[PDB]
Design an enzyme around this catalytic site. Structure first.
Site, PDB file in Angstrom:
ATOM      1  N   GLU A 306       0.785  -1.557  -0.216  1.00  0.00           N
ATOM      2  CA  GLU A 306      -0.078   0.033   0.343  1.00  0.00           C
ATOM      3  C   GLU A 306       0.549   1.626   0.069  1.00  0.00           C
ATOM      4  OE1 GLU A 306      -2.399  -0.613   3.345  1.00  0.00           O
ATOM      5  OE2 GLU A 306      -3.601  -1.404   2.148  1.00  0.00           O
ATOM      6  N   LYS A 308       2.391   4.665   1.083  1.00  0.00           N
ATOM      7  CA  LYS A 308       1.997   5.263   2.938  1.00  0.00           C
ATOM      8  C   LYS A 308       2.353   7.053   2.644  1.00  0.00           C
ATOM      9  CE  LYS A 308       6.166   4.942   7.054  1.00  0.00           C
ATOM     10  NZ  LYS A 308       5.596   6.947   7.146  1.00  0.00           N
ATOM     11  N   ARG A 313      -2.108   9.638  11.257  1.00  0.00           N
ATOM     12  CA  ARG A 313      -2.838   8.322  11.583  1.00  0.00           C
ATOM     13  C   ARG A 313      -3.952   9.388  12.796  1.00  0.00           C
ATOM     14  NH1 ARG A 313       0.180   3.182  13.465  1.00  0.00           N
ATOM     15  NH2 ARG A 313      -2.198   1.944  12.300  1.00  0.00           N
ATOM     16  N   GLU A 361      -5.520   7.142   7.566  1.00  0.00           N
ATOM     17  CA  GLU A 361      -4.825   8.815   7.367  1.00  0.00           C
ATOM     18  C   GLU A 361      -4.753   9.625   7.225  1.00  0.00           C
ATOM     19  OE1 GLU A 361      -1.718   8.457   8.627  1.00  0.00           O
ATOM     20  OE2 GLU A 361       0.170   9.603   7.411  1.00  0.00           O
ATOM     21  N   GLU A 460       4.591   8.643   0.941  1.00  0.00           N
ATOM     22  CA  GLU A 460       6.627   7.905   1.010  1.00  0.00           C
ATOM     23  C   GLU A 460       7.592   7.018   0.667  1.00  0.00           C
ATOM     24  OE1 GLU A 460       6.254   8.981   5.536  1.00  0.00           O
ATOM     25  OE2 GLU A 460       5.702  10.317   5.407  1.00  0.00           O
ATOM     26  N   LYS A 465       2.208  -5.789   4.036  1.00  0.00           N
ATOM     27  CA  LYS A 465       1.341  -6.461   4.599  1.00  0.00           C
ATOM     28  C   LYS A 465       1.184  -7.660   4.433  1.00  0.00           C
ATOM     29  CE  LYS A 465      -0.450  -1.881   6.384  1.00  0.00           C
ATOM     30  NZ  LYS A 465      -1.918  -1.131   6.014  1.00  0.00           N
ATOM     31  N   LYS A 484       7.736  -1.317   6.659  1.00  0.00           N
ATOM     32  CA  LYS A 484       7.278   0.635   5.627  1.00  0.00           C
ATOM     33  C   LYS A 484       8.357   0.203   5.133  1.00  0.00           C
ATOM     34  CE  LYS A 484       9.703   2.490   9.886  1.00  0.00           C
ATOM     35  NZ  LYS A 484       8.975   3.607  10.915  1.00  0.00           N
TER      36      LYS A 484
HETATM   37  P1  LIG Z   1       6.174   5.555  10.666  1.00  0.00           P
HETATM   38  O1  LIG Z   1       6.688   6.358  10.075  1.00  0.00           O
HETATM   39  O2  LIG Z   1       6.800   4.293  11.244  1.00  0.00           O
HETATM   40  O3  LIG Z   1       5.150   4.665   9.186  1.00  0.00           O
HETATM   41  C1  LIG Z   1       3.802   4.569   9.739  1.00  0.00           C
HETATM   42  C2  LIG Z   1       2.893   5.493   9.820  1.00  0.00           C
HETATM   43  O4  LIG Z   1       2.483   5.281   8.546  1.00  0.00           O
HETATM   44  C3  LIG Z   1       0.669   5.711   8.283  1.00  0.00           C
HETATM   45  N1  LIG Z   1       0.373   5.148   6.875  1.00  0.00           N
HETATM   46  C4  LIG Z   1       0.491   6.450   5.944  1.00  0.00           C
HETATM   47  N2  LIG Z   1      -0.072   5.511   4.746  1.00  0.00           N
HETATM   48  C5  LIG Z   1      -0.213   4.201   5.549  1.00  0.00           C
HETATM   49  C6  LIG Z   1      -0.794   3.184   5.096  1.00  0.00           C
HETATM   50  N3  LIG Z   1      -1.564   2.209   3.961  1.00  0.00           N
HETATM   51  N4  LIG Z   1      -0.699   1.822   6.545  1.00  0.00           N
HETATM   52  C7  LIG Z   1      -0.225   2.074   7.636  1.00  0.00           C
HETATM   53  N5  LIG Z   1       0.136   2.816   8.051  1.00  0.00           N
HETATM   54  C8  LIG Z   1       0.185   4.634   7.070  1.00  0.00           C
HETATM   55  C9  LIG Z   1       0.077   5.758  10.058  1.00  0.00           C
HETATM   56  O5  LIG Z   1       0.133   6.819   9.905  1.00  0.00           O
HETATM   57  C10 LIG Z   1       1.310   4.989  10.843  1.00  0.00           C
HETATM   58  O6  LIG Z   1       1.465   5.175  12.175  1.00  0.00           O
END
Ligand SMILES: *P(=O)(O)OC[C@H]1O[C@@H](n2cnc3c(N)ncnc32)[C@H](O)[C@@H]1O
Length: 641
Positions: A306, A308, A313, A361, A460, A465, A484
DNA sequence: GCTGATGCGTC
DNA sequence: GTCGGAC
DNA sequence: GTCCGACGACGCATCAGC
């Protein structure tokens, strides 16, 4: 007897006979401080857990009402995160209070704290000029915790002076090591080496070995003594997981501890369950430095990639009956700052949806150009309580998980099903609510291309997953279950700059006694001046950091060079003759209100700084005149588009 | 009533 | 947020 | 792999000082 001799690291620790207070008495704060001392003296987490567990067992056996405050003291928290209590104290207020309590000049206290890398050692090794001949009564754990909360609740004009009065009052009453840990707590740097996961382990161990709710004197002070070491270990692991899974669903000690004391740990999940309106711990991500590492970690398991997204969040709760709450990644209440989101909830869910918890997000969205905007833009939204007409920066929600639906917890369900429930029961609207762009594949070429596309599409990198194998939302089993994948993780890929070291900052905590950070600069060709661009404090090994201290000591200057410009940047503790050039990597470049590097080249008022800078290596082969130029910095920033 | 410094919460 | 240290 | 605490930029909210 005397809490000064309390030894919670003692072999064969007996919760009654080895405590330093009597049944029903308040837990002395010195008991907590002595426990902190024994924890900070060791490096093995399991030994820290054992020592804290010993304290907690005595608290359970002798003074159960003090369990909750002792736990918060050990975490250096004031209460549940969704309640938003904050001390409103930083080094400034704390150092002034220390100076006043000890009757010393502020600058002497400030200089000593910087040299020692610890405010606690300064507060502890000076007497307080407000002490009378006969000291006040000993501090208690609950008393100190209540005073911390008193500080946090003081607000408004003249509140700082009131906070200081409370702090000075604490220091007047401190004995032995107490002032060290009071000061560290107030500065937010308790730095035990033991935090949330170890506290939970100590707590489940304590209540397992010394059950709460026993008629006094407790018939059972060590419930593991009849077990073999093997059976005891298995049992404590099982009990630990019961507490951890409950806590991850309900990370609120105000709710858990009363239940634990009244009903015990085995009945805990029957009283504290995941529910909309109660924030839960989010699933986190492990940084993965290549597509080959992804395949190594997930092996044969099918996974999804997916985008990022680069926002914040938002954990969105819709309760039965229609109330909506939104929480941050750290369980802070964000409901008030998303009135726009709340008004759009009817639009995102089908009418058959009666309750849910969504993982999303929030991303700043330009409705005129219909495109994602940088994180910096998102952070210009207001916080706390915001009315709907105030909204200037619009947000688009990118939804990627579903944790609860129509009364069903999905914590133990595989992502394949959670995602199918998300996709089928919610409704996409461009620029308001959309599902994260995804790709289900095992082809390396497609993944690499998908990663490239994610960056072109203003993201990013990728989240990866598994869909069916170890693909649940059970944070207690693995909190970093997702991967990530970012381009700047790859060696040779991403923006590296060669930057000049122009200053150093004395280290704190683990960095005490050496440099903890450095001030870096780019070279402005047009003015032939070095311009501060960012600070730097990660990326070097301990050995490299000692080498830096050795190589830079000869470059210390008493005053800055006239051709070095730092403007509003934090003045370094040691100015350095510009000479060392280091290779620095970042995720992106940002428009800075502080740093002068390249000011005027992209923006009239703002220079450029680095997002997530880290040290890579020393450029022995570069002098400052060959460092990255401020014009090159501006060019790098522009091509982020 | 306004501004700079500081704390806090995002990443 | 990134990173390295200790286990 | 887990846990932890060094350290990064940034901008709103708050409050002392004006
Ligand atoms: P950090 O840089 O450790 O990364 C986790 C955070 O990335 C954000 N995020 C953006 N897009 C996603 C998707 N598709 N799935 C999960 N997390 C995502 C969240 O805010 C995480 O906290």
């Amino acid at each position: 007897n005397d809490p000064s001799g309390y030894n919670p690291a003692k072999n064969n620790y007996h919760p009654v006979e080895d405590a330093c207070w009597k049944p029903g008495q308040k837990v002395p704060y010195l008991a907590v401080a002595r426990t902190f001392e024994k924890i900070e003296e060791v490096s093995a987490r399991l030994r820290m857990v054992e020592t804290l567990s010993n304290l907690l067992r005595s608290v359970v056996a002798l003074s159960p009402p003090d369990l909750l405050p002792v736990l918060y003291l050990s975490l250096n928290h004031l209460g549940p995160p969704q309640q938003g209590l904050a001390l409103g104290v930083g080094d400034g207020v704390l150092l002034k209070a220390v100076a006043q309590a000890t009757g010393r000049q502020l600058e002497s206290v400030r200089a000593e704290a910087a040299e020692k890398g610890d405010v606690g050692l300064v507060a502890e090794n000076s007497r307080s000029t407000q002490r009378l001949m006969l000291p006040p009564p000993p501090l208690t754990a609950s008393g100190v915790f209540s005073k911390f909360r008193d500080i946090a609740r003081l607000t408004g004009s003249a509140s700082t002076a009131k906070k200081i009065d409370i702090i000075k009052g604490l220091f007047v009453a401190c004995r032995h090591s107490e002032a060290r840990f009071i000061a560290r707590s107030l500065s937010g740097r308790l730095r035990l080496g033991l935090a949330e996961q170890s506290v939970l382990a100590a707590l489940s161990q304590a209540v397992s070995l010394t059950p709460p709710g026993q008629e006094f004197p407790p018939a059972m002070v060590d419930a593991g003594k009849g077990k073999t070491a093997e059976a005891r270990k298995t049992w404590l692991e099982e009990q630990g997981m019961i507490l951890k899974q409950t806590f991850c669903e309900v990370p609120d000690l105000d709710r858990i501890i009363p239940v634990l004391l009244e009903h015990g740990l085995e009945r805990l999940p029957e009283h504290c369950k995941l529910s909309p309106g109660i924030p839960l711990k989010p699933m986190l991500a492990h940084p993965t430095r290549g597509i080959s590492e992804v395949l190594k970690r997930f092996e044969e398991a099918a996974f999804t990639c997916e985008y990022k997204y680069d926002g914040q969040r938002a954990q969105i709760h819709a309760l039965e009956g229609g109330e909506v709450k939104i929480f941050s990644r750290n369980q802070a209440d964000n409901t008030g700052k998303y009135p726009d989101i709340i008004s759009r909830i009817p639009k995102i869910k089908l009418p058959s949806v009666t309750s849910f918890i969504l993982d999303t997000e929030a991303v700043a969205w330009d409705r005129e150009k219909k495109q994602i905007q940088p994180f910096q833009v998102l952070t210009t939204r207001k916080r706390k309580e915001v009315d709907a007409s105030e909204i200037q920066v619009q947000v688009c929600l990118y939804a990627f998980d579903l944790i609860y639906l129509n009364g069903e917890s999905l914590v133990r369900e595989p992502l394949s099903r959670r995602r199918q429930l998300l996709r089928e029961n919610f409704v996409e609207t461009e620029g308001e609510f959309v599902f994260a762009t995804s790709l289900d594949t095992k082809d390396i070429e497609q993944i690499a291309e998908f990663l490239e596309q994610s960056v072109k599409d203003s993201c990013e990198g990728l989240m990866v997953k598994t869909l069916d194998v170890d693909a649940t939302y059970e944070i207690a089993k693995r909190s970093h279950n997702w991967l990530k994948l970012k381009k700047d993780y790859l060696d040779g890929v991403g923006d590296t700059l060669d930057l000049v070291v122009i200053g150093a900052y004395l280290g704190r905590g683990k960095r005490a006694g050496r440099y903890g950070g450095f001030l870096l600069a780019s070279y402005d060709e047009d003015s032939e001046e070095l311009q501060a661009i960012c600070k730097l404090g990660t990326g070097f090994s301990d050995e490299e950091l000692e080498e830096h201290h050795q190589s830079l000591k000869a470059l210390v200057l008493p005053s800055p060079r006239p051709y070095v410009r730092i403007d509003g940047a934090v003045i370094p503790d040691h100015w350095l003759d510009p000479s060392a050039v280091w290779e620095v990597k970042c995720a992106d470049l940002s428009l800075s209100p502080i740093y002068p590097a390249a000011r005027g080249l992209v923006d009239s008022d703002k220079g450029i700084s680095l997002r997530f800078p880290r040290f890579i290596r020393v450029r022995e082969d570069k002098q400052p005149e060959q460092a990255t130029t401020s014009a090159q910095v501006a060019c790098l920033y522009r091509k982020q588009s």
